Amino acid sequence: EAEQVWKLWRRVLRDERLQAQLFSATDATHWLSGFSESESKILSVYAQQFDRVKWFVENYQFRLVNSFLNALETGAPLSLRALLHINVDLNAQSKAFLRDRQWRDYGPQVYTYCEDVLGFLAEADELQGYPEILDLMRLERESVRLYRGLVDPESLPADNRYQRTSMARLYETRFALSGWLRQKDQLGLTRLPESTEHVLIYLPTLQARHKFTLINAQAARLYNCLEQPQSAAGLFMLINSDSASVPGSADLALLDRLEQLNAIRKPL
Amino acid sequence: MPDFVKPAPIGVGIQYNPEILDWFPFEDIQVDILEILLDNIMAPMDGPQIIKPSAQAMIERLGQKFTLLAHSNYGCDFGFSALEETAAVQRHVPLAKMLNSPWVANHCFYGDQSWLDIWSSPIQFSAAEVARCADRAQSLQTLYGMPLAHENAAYYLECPGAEMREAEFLARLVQRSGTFLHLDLHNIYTNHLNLKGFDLKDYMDTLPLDKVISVHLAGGSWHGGLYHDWHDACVPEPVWDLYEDLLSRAQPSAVILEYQGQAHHAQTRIMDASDESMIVRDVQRAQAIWSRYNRH
């Protein structure tokens, strides 16, 4: 038997709970159960070693339960500390995630692993309380999407328009998450005032660790009004109530802070 | 002459665990090598980074005092996907060059559905696999830019479709590929203890021992209910015997011992003054055997 159909036979085996139960329950004359001719041929090779085969499945399922935690530390490290502080049953959530996700092995794709996990935990009933922890996970999800967006990062126009860079994203919070960002020991444990805070996630250089810094409302509106590459007049007409087409009091200063934070590109 | 040759012997080294450096007696015990797991310092493949920024700061401190060896485990070196799409080419080949590793180490398993310590799955010992993997090994060694060695694995069940002995697969693979070998003597002893018909003499006779650039001496791993880890999770004397035989029949470039994280436990703190001290006691013995067979 070509070994590719051997590995191809294990992934479906290692990813289906029902088919794995059929091995321990019965080995039958009528084509086993739910297995093809060649698949049964490869299976009959393990007919004597059924007990150790079950050990491999249990060991495989156990590593994916621990791959879940490493993803949460690679992306969303703060959210992991918050879940650890409030003692959410991560082993149960990891099994719930993988079973719902058909026991997928994300492998080297850790940010895709982390982004999907933060989406699963956002809908988890155990976490429907603690509203601030949900806010932290959404912020860290934007940090995950920032890393994912720098793979094949679209393209650089380098035009004469105020334009965004792929090395920054903005997340408007529902709570004052900045309190947790400074004293990480209070993650998850304390309660936060419901204040909208504009947290810009950015990488100063492509090889560096991302950082969180807060920008003001006008700085956020400039970033929002640069959602698509907009001309000098377009950016100032959109944000200003007068549609004056000239930079307001704060705009030219904040557009400088945004460039220093590797968030925008000035026209040139 | 083959564009890749076995480097001059470096000496005895250990695998890198954050704990060992805290207590290891440097300035008393000469250690100039450190095995760095490339998958432990690699940044995600769905991200734009090669090395995780935290690990990059650690790498440079270690590089000053020690020579850093690269170990690739879960990179799909011998998988069915195209080599250029594997973790080895994308995130492991560049990391070894960051370490300036003298050579790289590979594992002869399939990265998917395999855990190095507890549960592994072997490569099919067949003629098609000798051809398929050596073509990948030759191509991967060219990309790495340094001698690539493949580590023999310990398996509890043999892959269906076996056509040859494990040593002959490794022997025919390295001849066709031109790559080298990283011998985990514990895995040979484990297979001899558990697997039926495993001939330790045939394994060492069949192998091209002149292609062994590195050796792996490891304490007893801890698999649940396996007879291994018999007295303690330290390098067993049968493994020590193969180390002497390996140096009596060939000259490797280096030997690596491993902390292996959690391995042995006791009701008292530990069944010695320090198993961490046993690490000292094992390194000294390996240094003696190395110097006893020093070819200068």
Author numbering:
A (entry chain C): 2 to 269
B (entry chain D): 1 to 296
Cite, word for word, the article reporting this structure.
The next unusual PTM reaction on TglA-Cys is performed by a complex formed by TglH and TglI, in which the cysteine β-methylene (β-CH2) of TglA-Cys is removed to generate TglA-CysΔCH2.
Unlike the reported homologous structure of MbnB,32,33 no extra electron density in the active center of the TglH map was observed, suggesting that the crystallized protein lacks metal ions, and therefore, this structure was termed apoTglHI. Two extended loops of apoTglH, L1 (residues 41–53) and L3 (residues 151–166), are inserted into two grooves formed by α7–8 (G2) and α1–3 (G1) of the TglI NTD, respectively, forming a mortise and tenon-like structure. Moreover, L3 buried in G1 forms a hydrophobic interface II with a buried surface area of ~320 Å2. Notably, the TglI CTD is not involved in the interaction between apoTglH and TglI, likely because of the role of the CTD in recognition of the longer LP of the cognate substrate. Although apoTglH and MbnB exhibit comparable overall structures, the specific inter-subunit interactions of apoTglHI are distinct from those of MbnBC.
